[PDB]
Design a protein around this ligand. Structure first.
Ligand SMILES: [Zn+2]
Lengths: 79, 71, 106, 365, 527, 522
């Protein structure tokens, strides 16, 4: 029973086409940002897995942690 | 390098067609030249003069060709 | 030219027509407007905000369509002289809306 | 293994290659593909490959390396000592691509002309194509800071081939129809000093180079031919006699004279080689001595990364410093595409008859 | 029918040589390389001088270097070139004759070809002959496993390995130089040793005898500040990476100063930071500091202001050589450094080694140190360069000896017994491999002939006697009286060599010549 | 000045018919002669050097053909076949060509007669069709039998596969290696798994197969020598994420007023990798491997903390490694767990040929090994690999199919006799084609005896005669220079190899036969 995931979307944090670069003003944002940067990607891919999707497809760019997460979730990928 | 070193060869239907084409050319350049209603043709010699005659032979007599069957 | 989506209806019995030229492709405003954020959460919040303008644009039509084509039988078609966002295309797609982009000015 | 510094010659090409955006760079993240920016681990200079952390020549082009090879690396090089050259090439790379895309639009719009309008303009004069400068490479670093120089390189194959094609084709359409570009200049030295900048053209601060200290996002600059365009005493006949390129450059199909642009992208005029040179090759109008300063930190880097006998070993007498100063005198030869020295000298119409403005690149009869 | 046709582009300039004519052609080429190298072997051998494309020169006896410098055009030659390169980094010298082994074998191999004999069997027998050689060789092999702390088997072996090199002037010293060097840095628990732990350092000038290994590390750097005192007795050492400047977070970072007090505090901080780390190191109790990167001229003086000399712009590998030799650590931070991480040594002193030059820095560490350097002085740059490679190579064989503590007296005795050992089998060979046997055996014979010819004696009058004694006697310890000493007991003459050296050597050679025999046809593109 | 209109572009060449067709037949015959000597236990190998000057030796003709940049078109088809068969089964690609040309060779005299090609290939398809099934009939399995270790035949297959390539005297050595090596490959069965290390120098008989993974690769970092190089029962850290202070992290400008805030920032910069390292040290691994570079500073910590680390690792060997110890490559240091942790019996790192290698194996649960290929010739390395790979892929097919046949040309002679008798069955024009079909068929031993320099005819006359009744697997012996049961002599080949060989050859000529003219465009 194959659960196929199809995305013209590339497998990366949805890059806003206009330039949002992180700017910080205090320290902890450094700690927080990349951690959450990881954290929500896990939440993104989990939300996918919550639906039981076992294979994901795209031609677009794949984020390494994202596939790292998919591998953590026993998921299949297309490129 | 084998046979005669820049001597071409040809064979078969292409050849036979070529002769036919060359043949067909030969007649038509003259097909108008016969009859009491014929035409009369004027020619450019190699050596400056002018010849006008209906008799095809002289017309052909003044013809330089490369195709052999034409010759 | 034709629709840019497979789910797009090839044929419609009764057509209600949208003639327009304003882009429903994304656009970013004419002024240099450099933004940042500090959170990747904002990054996604910045994702949704950017789309929202076109989101309303298409939203105005769909309500109108739904204000217009409350009946199921009627089919709704759109024509743009400029191009159309795929997300907008999807927006119409879920509503089964025929739309066309990039028409010659005449 | 032990490694040696590259010779000055290997540097010169890498310099020369850099201002053509064609430097081969090796990175752990991306390998040798520079589409996606990464910190350089190996680069090609001349025929050789060098470790960017020790600046010892770690290989050769023929050797077709797949990796930064293991060697006794001083690791004494920081990124900052060479990032400036890393800056110019990627900026060059982005610039040519934008320059590539722009000409195609004019060429596209040139060919989308119906015969009658060209027939009408050829006889009557008037605007034929006006490409909205708001459309000019709107996502690159020379138009908006939503981009950056680090941004992934727009993937374009046969870039020089297509650049050669579209320039030559576009010029022939102008050459055959003697049309009037508002984006061309008889001597790009004028673009920086001597021309009038009109209205909104005036903010321009010309760096004349590709460096991080420049603010390289800048407006698309073209000449203001509005006075010519709407002038009855400068109507169709007068412009044919004076304004069209072939008056000053010679006929595009029959001239070696380079054809240069207004500062379309990054406030940098382009230098297109003449058709009779065999190709229409594009260059930014940048002096070689400004090219050389891109390495001045690295020269110092070697000064404190390498021993003198090692430096003298690879650079010869004088080491890099005398080389650098010597190369500075030889930059007009060694860092100079000839096309930047092949512009016409007998000038009839020129560049100083109309101000440069910020506006739409356009062509009229 | 008959008419021209294209199979490969440039078919005109695709030349092609096939079969025996090609075979011998390669043999002809091979002999040239052999004859190129014959003179390069042995204490009486004479070494070659290469000229670089950029006009530089190099005189050397290491054939690997010779070929590495050699620019041939024949492809098989390059195979020989890399072949030696493969042997050298595998073992070392012996390369003095490695190729010479191959071609003479090939030279005689053609003799079999001249007998029409098919290469495949010729490939076959020689390999069998090769296996024959080694199992004979290691049987008659001596060992230095049986030896006590190996002080002067190695010295002899080093003495042996250096008699082929021009550095033989005082080679006894250098023999000692290496053996101390290797034993210090060796892992007997491992049977290996990394050559990185060895720092070769040769600066021109002085005599060859002025070459001196340094139980420590030498720095091609002077003092960070000229007023800092040249000598330092105590060696409380600081090893630093973070250059002595304001730290700058390498993510794109910048401050946006607005008001007066904004300026002042940073201006205030600007000096305040320097005092901090100046305090920081001072509190560590170190005596000397060293930095990989830059200094600020200000804090440099301030660092001089507290009698704590430091070193700036220190190359990577050496710093750890400093660290390990001191046993010291590498800290990237001021705060996180503590006295425990500090290096200690016996002595550090800069040396004005040049009469007219800038200077060098040496660290005469006095505790145990797994890294070490050798300092070479001498009269010519190339002479330095010859020494380095020669010295470099001598290290390997002792390393090679570390891997295997069983050796054989060199001087040509070893293989001599083998061909005899080979020959004895050749009678119980049976057929045509029988011819193959004596062929390779006859092939093997050349090396002593190379020696005695380079000895200027009658090669054959020598070995013929040499065999018969090793025929009459069973002692495989009679080589060539290379230095004209009436004793053939090379064991007493102490001319010795590791088992592997020859063992890999000929075994290497066999496989190559196998391929050499293996090919028949070549299609060369026209240049 | 009128001119006749040309048909196509000037110089658009055409040549049609018999003379056109035969030219390729000669051209194909030209091809084989460059490969004629090649295959055989006493066969041959070639060296070809590019116009670049990089020489290349080869014994596999397909490799040689790939070097042999053909300009004739029909020949390229031959070249293509090699790739297919090489992509299928390997050496005998050598043979594959010879069958192809020889079939064309004997057909050419009948091509002399203006025979419709469609007749010709019709028999070929049939002749091929019957042959395969007859081959299928005489296929040999062993799992039914008693005296086979499921590996013994594979060992037999390789020696047979091996006893032509450059290490032919070390087949009995390598055979065990690869058979043991292929044995660990279960069950993905792709070749990318096992690494090959063209380690320079050393005797090829010293070339090593390690029941694990190692690297020819490393790179100088600061303390990279300083940390211990022995790890007796280590726990394995495998990182893809780089380790350096935001060397290549997100593009980000920052704005900060208070100097101390700026103070705090760089600390926070360092606080990251310290936190990362804290994850790493607290993880319990001692060896850290990464495709990305490693910050020198962390290496000091690993070196200070008696853990090993490594950066710039190839992605490939990382996958091999993670596959080997079963550990999992990671990008998030926080989401770490010991489950993703490799463990090996031991870790080490060794010099070989001057080169800095890194050792770790003994992991009992690893479907991947690696090949240390000692060898003093640069040219040996790739060529052996070509041998090494070729051995691997075929025996994988051997594991794939319990189908073997004897070698030494016996099959082909066995085939020819069978068809030859079958030729009597069929009357008419086809019979000669069958007769020729069998006639070209026996080429294979003939090449052998040539490459052995033997009186193949007398052998062949002995061969066919003894192959009338006396036994199927009689065939050429090189050393005895005559007939022998090569099967009991363990000259054993997977059937599919020749099965595929003839099939591709059949279509080869069939494609070849199907051409009447050529058209050239500049
Ligand atoms: Zn380096």
């Amino acid at each position: 029973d194959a659960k196929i995931a199809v995305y013209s979307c590339p497998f990366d944090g949805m890059i806003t086409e206009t330039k949002g670069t992180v700017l910080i003003k205090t320290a902890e944002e450094l700690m927080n940002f990349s951690k959450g940067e990881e954290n929500l990607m896990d939440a993104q891919v989990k939300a996918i897995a919550d639906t039981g999707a076992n294979v994901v497809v795209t031609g677009g760019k794949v984020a390494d942690m994202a596939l790292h997460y998919a591998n953590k979730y026993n998921i299949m990928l297309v490129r | 390098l084998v046979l005669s070193q820049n001597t071409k060869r040809e064979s078969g239907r292409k050849v036979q067609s070529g002769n036919i084409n060359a043949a067909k050319t030969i007649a038509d350049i003259i097909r108008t030249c016969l009859g009491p209603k014929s035409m009369m043709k004027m020619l450019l010699d190699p050596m400056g003069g002018i010849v006008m005659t209906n008799d095809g032979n002289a017309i052909l007599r003044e013809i330089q060709v490369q195709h052999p069957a034409a010759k | 030219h034709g629709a840019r989506h497979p789910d797009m209806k090839k044929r419609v019995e009764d057509a209600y027509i949208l003639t327009c030229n304003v882009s429903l492709e994304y656009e970013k405003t004419e002024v240099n407007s450099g933004f940042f954020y500090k959170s990747a959460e904002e990054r996604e919040k910045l994702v949704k905000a950017e789309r929202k303008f076109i989101e309303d644009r298409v939203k105005k039509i769909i309500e109108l369509k739904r204000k217009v084509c409350g009946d199921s039988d009627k089919g709704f078609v759109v024509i743009n002289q400029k191009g159309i966002d795929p997300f907008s295309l999807d927006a119409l797609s879920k509503e089964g809306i025929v739309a066309l982009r990039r028409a010659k000015r005449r | 293994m032990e490694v040696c510094l590259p010779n000055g010659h290997q540097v010169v090409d890498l310099i020369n290659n850099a201002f053509e955006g064609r430097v081969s760079i090796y990175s752990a993240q991306e390998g040798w593909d520079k589409t996606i920016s990464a910190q350089p681990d190996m680069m090609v200079c001349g025929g050789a490959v060098v470790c960017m952390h020790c600046l010892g020549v770690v290989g050769s082009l023929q050797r077709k390396l797949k990796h930064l090879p293991h060697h006794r690396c001083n690791q004494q090089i920081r990124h900052q000592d060479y990032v400036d050259v890393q800056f110019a090439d990627r900026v060059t790379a982005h610039w040519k691509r934008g320059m590539l895309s722009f000409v195609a639009q004019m060429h596209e719009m040139m060919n989308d002309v119906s015969p009658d309008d060209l027939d009408r303009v050829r006889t009557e004069g008037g605007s034929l194509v006006e490409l909205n400068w708001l459309q000019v490479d709107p996502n690159s670093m020379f138009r908006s800071i939503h981009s950056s120089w680090t941004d992934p390189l727009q993937v374009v194959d046969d870039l020089d081939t297509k650049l050669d094609q579209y320039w030559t084709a576009l010029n022939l359409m102008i050459d055959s129809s003697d049309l009037i570009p508002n984006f061309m200049m008889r001597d790009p030295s004028h673009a920086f000093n001597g021309v009038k900048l009109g209205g909104d053209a005036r903010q321009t601060q010309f760096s004349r180079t590709f460096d991080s200290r420049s603010s390289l996002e800048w407006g698309v600059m073209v000449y203001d031919y509005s006075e010519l365009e709407h002038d009855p005493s400068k109507g169709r006949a007068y412009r044919k006699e004076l304004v069209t390129p072939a008056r000053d450059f010679g006929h595009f199909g029959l001239s070696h004279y380079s054809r240069a642009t207004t500062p379309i992208l990054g406030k940098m005029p382009a230098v297109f080689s003449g058709m009779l040179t065999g190709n229409c090759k594009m260059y930014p109008f940048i002096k070689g001595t400004a090219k050389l300063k891109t390495v001045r930190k690295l020269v110092e880097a070697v000064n404190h990364a390498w021993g003198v006998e090692k430096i003298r070993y690879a650079l010869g007498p004088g080491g890099m410093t005398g080389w650098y100063n010597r190369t500075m005198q030889q930059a007009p030869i060694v860092l100079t595409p000839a096309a930047l020295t092949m512009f016409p000298d007998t000038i009839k119409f020129g560049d100083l008859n109309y101000p440069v403005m910020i506006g739409d690149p356009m062509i009229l009869g | 029918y008959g008419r021209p046709f294209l199979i490969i582009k440039d078919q005109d300039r695709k030349s092609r040589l096939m079969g025996l004519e090609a075979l011998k052609s390669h043999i002809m080429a091979a002999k040239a390389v052999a004859n190129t190298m014959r003179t390069s072997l042995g204490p009486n051998g004479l070494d070659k001088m290469m000229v670089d494309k950029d006009g530089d020169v190099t005189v050397t006896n290491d054939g690997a270097t010779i070929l590495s410098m050699m620019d041939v055009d024949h492809q098989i030659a390059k195979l020989m070139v890399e072949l030696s390169k493969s042997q050298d980094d595998e073992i070392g010298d012996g390369t003095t004759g490695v190729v010479v082994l191959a071609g003479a074998l090939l030279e005689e191999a053609e003799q079999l070809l001249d007998r029409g004999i098919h290469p495949i069997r010729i490939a076959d027998g020689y390999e069998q002959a090769a296996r024959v050689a080694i199992e004979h060789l290691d049987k008659i092999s001596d060992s230095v496993l049986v030896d006590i702390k190996d002080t002067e088997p190695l010295i002899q072996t080093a003495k042996t390995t250096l008699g082929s090199k021009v550095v033989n002037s005082c080679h006894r010293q250098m023999a000692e130089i290496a053996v101390n060097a290797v034993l210090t840095v060796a892992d007997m628990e491992r049977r290996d040793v990394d050559f990185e732990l060895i720092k070769v350092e040769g600066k021109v000038g002085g005599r060859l005898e002025d070459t001196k290994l340094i139980k420590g590390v030498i720095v091609d750097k002077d003092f960070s500040h000229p007023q800092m005192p040249k000598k330092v007795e105590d060696a409380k050492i600081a090893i630093l990476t973070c250059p002595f400047e304001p730290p700058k977070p390498k993510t794109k970072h910048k401050l946006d100063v607005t008001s007066v007090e904004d300026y002042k505090a940073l201006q205030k901080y600007e000096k305040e930071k320097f005092e901090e780390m100046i305090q920081q190191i001072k509190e560590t109790g170190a005596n000397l500091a060293i930095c990989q990167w830059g200094f600020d001229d200000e804090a440099n003086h301030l660092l001089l202001q507290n009698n704590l000399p430091a070193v700036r712009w220190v190359g990577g590998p050496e710093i750890e050589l400093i660290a390990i030799a001191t046993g010291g650590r590498i800290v990237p931070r001021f705060s996180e450094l503590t006295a425990e991480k500090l290096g200690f040594a016996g002595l550090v002193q800069e040396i004005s080694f040049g009469t007219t030059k800038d200077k060098m820095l040496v660290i005469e560490q006095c505790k145990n140190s797994r890294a070490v350097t050798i300092f070479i002085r001498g009269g010519n740059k190339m002479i330095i360069e010859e020494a380095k490679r020669s010295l470099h190579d001598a290290l390997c064989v002792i390393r090679n000896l570390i891997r295997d503590n069983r050796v054989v007296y060199g001087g040509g005795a070893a293989e001599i017994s083998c061909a005899l050992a080979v020959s004895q089998e050749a009678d119980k060979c049976p057929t045509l491999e029988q011819y193959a046997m004596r062929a390779f055996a006859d092939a093997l014979e050349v090396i002593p002939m190379a020696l005695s010819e380079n000895s200027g004696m009658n090669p054959i009058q020598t070995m013929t006697e040499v065999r018969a004694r090793q025929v009459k006697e069973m002692n495989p310890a009679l080589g060539i009286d290379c230095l004209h000493k009436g004793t053939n007991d090379m064991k007493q003459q102490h001319v010795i060599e590791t088992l592997i050296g020859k063992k890999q050597q000929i075994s290497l050679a066999t496989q190559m010549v196998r391929m050499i025999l293996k090919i028949d046809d070549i299609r060369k593109p026209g240049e | 000045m009128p001119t006749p209109v040309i048909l196509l572009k000037e110089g658009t060449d055409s040549s049609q018919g018999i003379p056109q067709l035969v030219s390729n037949i000669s051209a194909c015959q030209v091809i084989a002669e460059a490969v004629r000597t090649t295959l055989g236990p006493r066969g041959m190998d070639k060296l070809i050097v590019d116009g670049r000057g990089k020489a290349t030796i080869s014994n596999d003709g397909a490799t040689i053909l790939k070097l042999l940049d053909v300009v004739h078109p029909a020949a390229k088809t031959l070249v293509d076949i090699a790739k297919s068969q090489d992509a299928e089964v390997g050496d005998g690609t050598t043979s594959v060509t010879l069958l192809a040309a020889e079939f064309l060779k004997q057909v050419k005299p009948y091509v002399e007669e203006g025979l419709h090609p469609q007749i010709i290939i019709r028999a070929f398809r049939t002749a091929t069709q019957l042959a395969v099934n007859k081959i299928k009939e005489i296929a040999v399995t062993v799992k039914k039998a008693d005296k086979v270790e499921q590996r013994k035949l594979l060992e037999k297959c390789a020696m047979t596969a091996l006893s032509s390539k450059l290490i032919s005297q070390q087949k009995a050595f390598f055979a065990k290696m690869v058979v043991d090596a292929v044995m660990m490959l279960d069950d993905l069965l792709q070749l990318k798994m096992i690494g090959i290390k063209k380690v320079q120098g050393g005797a090829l008989e010293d070339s090593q197969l390690v029941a694990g993974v190692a690297f020819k690769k490393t790179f100088s970092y600061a303390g990279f020598e300083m940390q211990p190089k022995k790890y007796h029962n280590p726990k394995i850290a495998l990182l893809n994420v780089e380790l350096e202070l935001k060397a290549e992290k997100d593009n980000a400008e920052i704005r900060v007023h208070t100097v101390e805030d700026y103070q705090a920032i760089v600390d926070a910069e360092w606080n990251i990798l310290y936190d990362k390292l804290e994850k790493i040290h607290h993880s319990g691994a001692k060896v850290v491997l990464s495709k990305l570079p490693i910050g020198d500073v962390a290496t000091q910590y690993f070196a200070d903390r008696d853990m090993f680390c490594a950066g710039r690792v190839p992605e490939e060997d990382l996958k091999r490694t993670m596959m080997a110890c079963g550990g999992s490559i990671q990008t998030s240091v926080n989401a770490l767990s010991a489950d993703v942790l490799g463990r090996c019996q031991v870790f080490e790192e060794t010099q070989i040929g001057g080169e800095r290698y890194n050792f770790f194996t003994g992991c009992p649960k690893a479907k991947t090994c690696t090949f240390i290929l000692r060898g003093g010739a640069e040219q040996f390395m790739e060529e052996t690999e070509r041998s090494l790979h070729d051995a691997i892929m075929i025996v994988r097919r051997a594991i794939k199919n319990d189908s073997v046949v004897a070698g030494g040309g016996a099959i082909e002679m066995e085939l020819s006799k069978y068809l030859r008798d079958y030729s009597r069955t069929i009357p008419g024009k086809q019979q000669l084609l069958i007769g020729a079909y069998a006639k070209a068929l026996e080429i294979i031993p003939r090449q052998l005896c040539d490459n052995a320099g033997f009186d193949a005819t007398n052998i062949l006359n002995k061969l066919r005669a003894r192959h009338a009744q006396g036994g199927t697997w009689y065939g050429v012996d090189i050393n005895n220079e005559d007939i022998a049961d090569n099967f009991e002599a363990f000259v054993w080949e997977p059937a599919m190899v020749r099965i595929n060989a003839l099939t591709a050859a059949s279509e080869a000529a069939c494609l070849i036969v199907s051409v009447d003219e050529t058209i050239k465009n500049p």
